[model samples]
Target: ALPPLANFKDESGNEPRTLVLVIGESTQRGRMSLYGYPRETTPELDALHKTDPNLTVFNNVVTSRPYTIEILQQALTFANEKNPDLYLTQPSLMNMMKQAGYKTFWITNQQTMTARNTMLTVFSRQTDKQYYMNQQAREYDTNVLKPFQEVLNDPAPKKLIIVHLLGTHIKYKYRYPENQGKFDGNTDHVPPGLNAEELESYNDYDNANLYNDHVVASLIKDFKAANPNGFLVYFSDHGEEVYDTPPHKTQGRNEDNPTRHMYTIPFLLWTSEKWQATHPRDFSQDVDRKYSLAELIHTWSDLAGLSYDGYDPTRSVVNPQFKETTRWIGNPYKKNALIDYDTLPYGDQVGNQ
Candidate 1:
């Protein structure tokens, strides 16, 4: 439950818009071919990168926390590393948009149950409408597309939709259909020391990434067709450590044994032609600002043209007022402990250091 906001509309007059924020699962940018990986794990996003001029790719943005529930508690709301519990009293990005006259929607492919009692379900409750695409292992994110298209057709003058993806979560083979199983043990760059089964599982992760590429690109295409006068921002909740380093032994995220790949996730932006024309700027194709996902609410607020009490332009990576800030990630429950993202080496550069 979030507190009511004092204001939401932009001081400067803006037109009715549709803003779509897609939250991805355990996906590491280092694994995506678009981000210099050996595997063509993101052919669809790769093609879009080549074609879409308005598509903005961020080089260095890391999550405040590596786990989904932990990250979402801050990323979705105004809460951050400094004060995580503020989520209980502050309005979320969705809530702010709604207050500003946009109809809010949440569509997720994640399960309803979790070890923690209050999860995404709490966030979904804040939205005007929610569609749970999957509650079992047999579901794929592709199942979410139809409901998403339906939401696009809804008669809201201004709409804010959040699409939560299952993405390349563990048990990767179950994330996509049998046909999408494109990668195998023979795939390139199977880090050494992994057994045959481990190698196969690694390839399965890449295959799931390929499937994610399709699902995301399809959503972008559908949003374009709707002719919304706004933008779509896609970013993973956090990155997964899938043996991106040598010895190839480790998998999943370990807060104690942190790796660069585990926090280096992707953040992409695609704006409609109308949005670009209306709020035109020399949008940078490559932004390397060391950003933290905890500040995501501020960036999203800037994007949605919302200016409430908590809005801070200096925190937005897309805003000219943006400044390079130290990105820290660690267990929220821990005190006086965090990892400085720049201190860690990425991928191949790790061994050289």
Candidate 2:
């Protein structure tokens, strides 16, 4: 039996349109030069941001939860921190696109519907086409880039192509190509007296971030080359804390004990000139709006020019009527005990070593 999903009131099916979403994993904004990190961790992204007027970099956005499935369960659906189970009843972002008559495709480098990743797989199935590069061999993200071109070449008049990248997740050394390791030696951002292993982890994380930057930038370049009549949105599932804050003990995500880096994610948008000519939006002033990925559906709806039954303009960060709600983080199951991000200990404790 199918779930009781959204009933789109109007299908603003923008023909000849394409909307691309590139998902990154375990990447924090503070480590990337594009987000003001000291290191040149995102040199390629930085150049793209500088040269491309279509590229709008969002300053403040965070994921509700730290883990992949948990965060995406909200990000790709109607669920938010308060109403976490809405995804069970409400339609997902992909469902909305499908209902609106767009051909959908999912290209992922992350593990497929393995035992642990069923939810992501469930989301993948919402697409009309899929290019699955799962956990079998665990290859790098660049390999998944080919399916991107294949999707663009499709004859569909309206398309939603999503490319998921295994960006800088854990065992950071393996995420990038061998030659992509640029940040080697001299770990000053970490706390002093860190043993050999700890320091290496920090450095490797940055190197991996740089390569992830390459992968993301390359995808955008390809999309720009295609010059579709729509937009591309890129963000991470959540973020990793590789000794980014004070105390520096947290090296990964901690749902019980959170850090700024753990929730801090990179959010950006690239719109085609053609899409702008038709849709005609100026999101330049809206870039710094505080947003939670939990409310992503509303924002995506705003961009796609879609109107549905439960749609709220205030929940959309890109909308002119967007409201500033509390950026709540943590387990929603823990009722009445959510943490507001405004009260979090968020300082870049760099050079503390």
Candidate 3:
């Protein structure tokens, strides 16, 4: 079984290629149009794939941390910073690539991480490239990707560019396309006792996803154009609850799922034509390994042609990592051995008291 897992190395052993990580904020799985939703939120990306054929949609991807800063922080340290063996044995992908002589960049729309929020800021210190994140408001992808574009011109063959987007956050009300939110004839179409307020919130959340998807699609187009031999990875920091089903009481720091949607955020990958040709149909259906968000480092390492040593988070029931088991990543608390980033301490609430 382990041998099959190791096959990933054989299939994805290309070095001197560029790796781009597109991180989305507060993006949950349920709201996506591609992941079995009614809305056509991702028409651009999907449509482009039909004509271009270099897109690999990872339908089953999960995030480690639920909060923005938590996910970002853990991602920064995905490789080699701490002894992963203490909880588990693995270095984040960035650290692994850096050691192997690859240039890394961290770009984000989130606010500059504070000492209190060191997890997200870790990427800044660990990469060859970084961006301005002092602005805390929701940001667009153009502003985020500009820095990496400039760096790409410098001729770094083996590089990693991480771009984080402000996805449809709970400020869901703000995530709509112009002329959105009109229920029309479906005004009385929601479930009993669901309420108009709930439906509106959900609509806004979905619309926000629509906007984020376009942003991602655009980023992919530009990145592929700039670096045709590169690979672009996209996924959310975590999913948010918006339908008012779980009842949000603000459980200390992280919010409870008000919307009963799947906790899984999508994990997607887009590769260049040259690389895709070498390992065409290199698909695996194994599900034995319980993937944590922490394993993302290894994935990047594998893609970047770097000698990265870490687990593949996609190796879980939720994600399409391996080809054997079908068990969920399992209870984080029960294991207690791995880092459960979803609830890691953060914000003024966690350490101030």
Candidate 4:
């Protein structure tokens, strides 16, 4: 069932000119240099971090689930471990922003259909405007950038744009063009159990991460070019287990033996200087807030200056009244239990221990 659209209200009175959310795929924070990866996998983002004073990188944020559709069900709506059914009952982030008078858009590089009936199509349909840039499995994520630039020039006074990328997904060699294969044969950290093909896959994964850095940094550059009064948020749906765990040597997300790499994601916020000047209290540069993306609705609501019966100030990372809550990341239906993130072994040792 679709959520009712009439309950949303923008309490800020003065809306920002634009808002951008870039959703990344299969990116683990532990593999990127920005989050303490030994390799230079994110040179573009690393450069941006040093130069851009408005770039705020949150240190502690994890996805509620390890897959796309399930994580989106919560990250895009007001659903969490305790209330997993809210996705069916509550208005989505797109719906909330649209109801609050922002021109909403969903520009995605992921293939539109995953099954006969899918949540991806349903969410994309809810947007005021949507662009599906992928026509084949081998299409690069950079193709969406052109369409994103077009959306920025759409003449909307208040805009909410969502850019979804097929970043660092499986078959990583196909994620970047031939020239972007910076780490084609570089595998200093590949696990011992991987054969020749698996080692090559590991290197390709790093190369894909490098390409993702270029794509995301370029998006930020283009958004900054407009000089609009708003902010941009970027986060992955969940992280991937790219040979991070030794002995087990997992290659992807495993709920039964979940590692820190499967959930540690890069959550970045970039605000225009003008937007920062206008909303001083809302900007928290480099805050190490323990947050779960399942409660992203609260944080996004606080960012959009919206308030409603469901808005919880305590759940908002930007709000002054923000407080840490237990973050659980596992299946909830079958043999699934909501476990505290802090209690997970090796959780704190990922980077900044």
Model 4 spans > 4 angstroms off: 1-9, 114-116, 189-193, 282-286
lDDT of 1 by residue, 1-353 (tens): 55567665584256777889999999888888877787888888889999998888887788878888889999988888878887777777777777777799989898865335576777787789988877655688888899999998998888889999999999888998987678864756778778878888898999999999999999998999988888999999988888776657888898778887788788999999998898886658337777888899888877766776767888998888887677877776788777676676553452111
lDDT of each: 0.82, 0.84, 0.55, 0.84
Residue by residue across 1-353, what tens digits does model 2's lDDT show?
A: 34533466644444688899988999987888888778788989899988988899988898899999899999998888999998888788898888888899999998796455477878898899999876674489998778899999999998999999899897899897777667677765556766788888898999988889889998988888987898899999998888767676668888898888888889989888888777777888998888888998898888888886789899899998999999999899996868887677654343110
**Tens digits of per-residue lDDT for model 4, 13-58:** 5755889999999998888889887889999999999999889888
Positional deviation of residue 123's Cα in model 1 after best superposition, in angstroms: 0.4
Q: Could you give the candidate ranking by lDDT, starting with the highest?
A: 2, 4, 1, 3
| TM-score of model 1 (CA atoms) | 0.94
Error of 2 at 120 (Å): 1.5
- What are the models' TM-scores? 0.94, 0.94, 0.72, 0.94
Compared with the true structure, model 4 gives a TM-score of 0.94
Clashing pairs in 4: none
List pairs with backbone clashes in candidate 1: none
